Design a protein around this nucleic acid. Structure first.
Ligand code: MG
Ligand code: MG
Ligand code: MG
Ligand code: MG
Ligand code: MG
Ligand code: MG
Ligand code: MG
Ligand code: MG
Ligand code: MG
Ligand code: MG
Ligand code: MG
Ligand code: MG
Ligand code: MG
Ligand code: MG
Ligand code: MG
Ligand code: MG
Ligand code: MG
Ligand code: MG
Ligand code: MG
Ligand code: MG
Ligand code: MG
Ligand code: MG
Ligand code: MG
Ligand code: MG
Ligand code: MG
Ligand code: MG
Ligand code: MG
Ligand code: MG
Ligand code: MG
Ligand code: MG
Ligand code: MG
Ligand code: MG
Ligand code: MG
Ligand code: MG
Ligand code: MG
Lengths: 31, 117, 155
RNA sequence: ACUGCAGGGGAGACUGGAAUUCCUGGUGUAGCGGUGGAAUGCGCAGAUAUCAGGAGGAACACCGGUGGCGAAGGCGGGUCUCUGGGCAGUAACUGACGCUGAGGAGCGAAAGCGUGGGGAGCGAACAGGAUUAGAUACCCUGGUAGUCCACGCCGUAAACGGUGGGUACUAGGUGUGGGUUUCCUUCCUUGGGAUCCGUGCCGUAGCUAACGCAUUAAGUACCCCGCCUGGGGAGUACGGCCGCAAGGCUAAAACUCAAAGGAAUUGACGGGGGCCCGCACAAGCGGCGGAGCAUGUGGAUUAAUUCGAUGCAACGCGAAGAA
C-alpha cells in the first residue's frame, strides 16, 4: 500500500494549491 | 433516362451504419439506399440485417436505372461488410471485382481521446 | 437444467382414435387430475364436430394444428442497457404444445356457455383459420419478424 | 594522432505522400451522426455518401524491434548543408595531465507565461444533451486556450532502473547491436573460436527483512559527492533568492500520535478471470400481497394483558389443546 503515502502528500499539496488560488490577490499579494 | 450497364458499389460500413452507393465507373452516384433509408433507427442500423436490407434496396434501385454488372469498393470496420456484398449478389448484380478502400492514415490527424467507458 | 436435457414422457395411443395428439391435447386440458372429465370433453368435442365437418375429426384437428403451429418466437434477452427480444426457431414438439396450450387458454375465456362446445367451435374455426389463437399466430409472428434484426444474438 | 565503423545525436533550409477538415463544382436523395440506449447536433435551402479539383495545418503508416543514438530530458517521411558524441584497430605521440566535486553554471518532458505568426485534427475551460437522488463527472454534440512555429521565460515530472559518478575483481548459459582478429578459405558458411564496447533474459557464489539483485550487482573493496535520522504539522509558515505570473529553491517551530511504514503469509472479498453445482434463473403449474375468518407477532390499552423467540435461521415459534 505504498500509494497511500502518495495520496496523503497529494491531498496536502492539493489543499495548499487551493489556498494559494483562493489567495493570489491582495488577500495574499499585499502580504 | 440515364442508362449505364456497368457500375461501382461503394460500401461504407461504420460501427453505427452502412451506406451503399451505386455509381458509374466514372464515379457519379445513381442509387444510394442506406441503412436508415431502409426502416431502421438508432443502434439497429449497425446490424448486419440492416446492412443486407440497405444493400438489397440499393441494388434494386440501381437495377431500375439499368446496372447488371457492379464492382465493389468496401471500406469501414463494420459488421455489414459481407452481408452487404452477398445482398448485392443475390439482388441481381454481378459482383465483378472486389477491393478494399478503407483509408489508412500515414499517422496524420491526431485521433480523438479514448472513451473512458 | 445443468446436466443436459431431461427425458420426455411417452404418451400411448388413444383408444377411440388411433392418434397421439388427442391423448396429448386432453392432458393439456387436464386440471386438478380429472383425466376422465377432460377425456370425455375432448371426445365430445370431436363427436359434436363430425356432424358439422363431414371430414374425420382428427383430420380436422390436424388441419387446425397445422394452422396454429408456431415457427419462430420472440424469446427475450438483455445485453447492455436495454433488454430486447430475439427471434428463435421453435422445434416442432415445443411448437405443437405451445399452440394447443394457447388453444386451451383462449378456450377458457371464449364466449359460450360451457367448454365442450367452446372447444368444439375453437377446433372448427382453427381448422378454418379465423380464431383467437389463429390471430395470435400472425401477431406473434409479426412481432418476431419486426425483431429479426436481433437474430444475430442466438446465445 | 591515424585508419576504419554504426547510429531516429543536434541545428538550418527545401521538399514528399497517405489521411482528417474546409471550399468550389459533378452526381444523387432523406437521411446522417452518435450511444449501453438515446438526445443535443448536422440535412432536406440539398446533408451523409461518391467523383474531380483546390486551400491549409499537424503527424510522419509499412521500415519499426525486445533495436539504435543522446549526459539526462529526449530523437525517425525524404534530400542537402553545418555539426556533437561514441566504438574498434595501429602503437605514431604526451607522459598521471586522472576521479569526484561543496558552492556555481549549463541543459532540462509536459503543462504554463510573454510577443508575433499559424490553427487541420484534437481539446482543459465553457455550453447543450444524456445518465443520475444529485452529476459541477465518466458517455455524446459542439468547442476556447493550448497543442504547431520563431524568439525569450519557466526549471518542474512515477525527470524511475524509484539503483550518483569512477575503478578493480568475483561461475556460467542464452539472445541481440557496433567493431577487430585466427581454423576447414574457397569446405564460402558468410558457419566455429577469441577479444573490445554496448544492450536484454536466466542463473552460481555472495548479499537481502523479504521481494529479489546477481560481471549492466542491490556481491567483494577503495575514492569523492548528494541525501536520511518516527509519522503528521510540512516541503508548509517566516525570512531571503529567482520568476512577468504561475510558482520554484532554501527552509522551521509550536502542537499532536504511538505509531506511521516495507516485504511476505493465511483467509475474506471483488460491479476480476476459469471450471462447475443447486426449483438459482429459464419453460411451465398453482399460489400469497386483495376479501372474510383462524393463529402468532408489533403497537396500543388495561388491573394484568406472564415470559421467552425479532433477517434468512422470530412471528400456526416454545404452546402435541389457557372455561
Ligand atoms: Mg542527425
Ligand atoms: Mg488530399
Ligand atoms: Mg476551415
Ligand atoms: Mg456539394
Ligand atoms: Mg463531399
Ligand atoms: Mg617520453
Ligand atoms: Mg551542486
Ligand atoms: Mg535551460
Ligand atoms: Mg510546451
Ligand atoms: Mg505561447
Ligand atoms: Mg492565461
Ligand atoms: Mg498568440
Ligand atoms: Mg468532450
Ligand atoms: Mg455538461
Ligand atoms: Mg526551427
Ligand atoms: Mg522534485
Ligand atoms: Mg522518462
Ligand atoms: Mg528522487
Ligand atoms: Mg558504484
Ligand atoms: Mg555485455
Ligand atoms: Mg537473476
Ligand atoms: Mg539492500
Ligand atoms: Mg517528527
Ligand atoms: Mg514553498
Ligand atoms: Mg516568502
Ligand atoms: Mg511507506
Ligand atoms: Mg503487502
Ligand atoms: Mg494475499
Ligand atoms: Mg470468484
Ligand atoms: Mg431437487
Ligand atoms: Mg421462474
Ligand atoms: Mg389478505
Ligand atoms: Mg408475548
Ligand atoms: Mg410452520
Ligand atoms: Mg386460567
Amino acid at each position: 500500500g505504498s500509494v497511500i503515502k502518495k495520496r496523503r502528500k497529494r491531498m496536502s499539496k492539493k489543499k495548499h494549491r487551493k489556498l494559494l488560488r483562493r489567495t493570489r490577490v491582495q488577500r495574499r499579494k499585499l502580504g | 433516362k440515364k442508362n449505364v450497364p456497368h457500375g461501382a458499389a461503394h460500401i461504407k460500413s461504420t460501427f453505427n451504419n452502412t451506406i451503399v452507393t451505386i455509381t458509374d465507373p466514372q464515379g457519379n452516384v445513381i442509387a444510394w439506399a442506406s441503412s436508415g433509408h431502409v426502416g431502421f433507427k438508432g443502434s439497429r442500423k449497425s446490424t448486419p440485417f440492416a446492412a443486407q436490407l440497405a444493400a438489397e434496396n440499393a441494388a434494386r434501385k440501381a437495377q431500375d436505372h439499368g446496372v447488371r454488372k457492379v464492382d465493389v469498393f468496401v471500406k469501414g470496420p463494420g459488421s455489414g461488410r459481407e452481408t452487404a456484398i452477398r445482398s448485392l449478389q443475390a439482388a441481381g448484380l454481378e459482383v465483378g471485382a472486389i477491393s478494399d478502400v478503407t483509408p489508412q492514415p500515414h499517422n496524420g490527424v491526431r485521433p480523438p481521446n479514448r472513451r473512458r467507458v | 437444467p445443468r446436466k443436459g436435457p431431461a427425458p420426455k414422457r411417452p404418451l400411448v395411443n388413444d383408444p377411440v382414435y388411433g392418434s397421439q395428439l388427442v391423448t396429448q391435447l386432453v392432458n393439456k386440458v387436464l386440471l386438478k387430475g380429472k383425466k376422465s372429465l377432460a377425456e370425455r370433453i375432448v371426445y365430445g368435442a370431436l363427436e359434436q364436430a363430425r356432424d358439422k365437418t363431414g371430414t374425420d375429426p382428427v383430420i380436422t384437428l390436424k388441419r387446425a394444428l397445422d394452422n396454429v403451429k408456431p415457427a419462430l418466437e420472440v424469446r427475450s434477452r438483455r445485453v447492455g442497457g436495454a433488454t430486447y427480444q430475439v427471434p428463435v426457431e421453435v422445434r416442432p414438439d415445443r411448437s405443437t404444445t405451445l399452440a394447443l396450450r394457447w388453444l386451451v387458454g383462449y378456450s377458457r375465456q371464449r364466449r359460450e356457455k360451457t367448454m365442450i362446445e367452446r372447444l368444439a367451435n375453437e377446433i372448427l374455426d382453427a381448422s378454418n383459420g379465423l380464431g383467437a389463437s389463429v390471430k395470435r399466430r400472425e401477431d406473434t409472428h409479426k412481432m418476431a419478424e419486426a425483431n429479426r434484426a436481433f437474430a444475430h444474438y442466438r446465445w
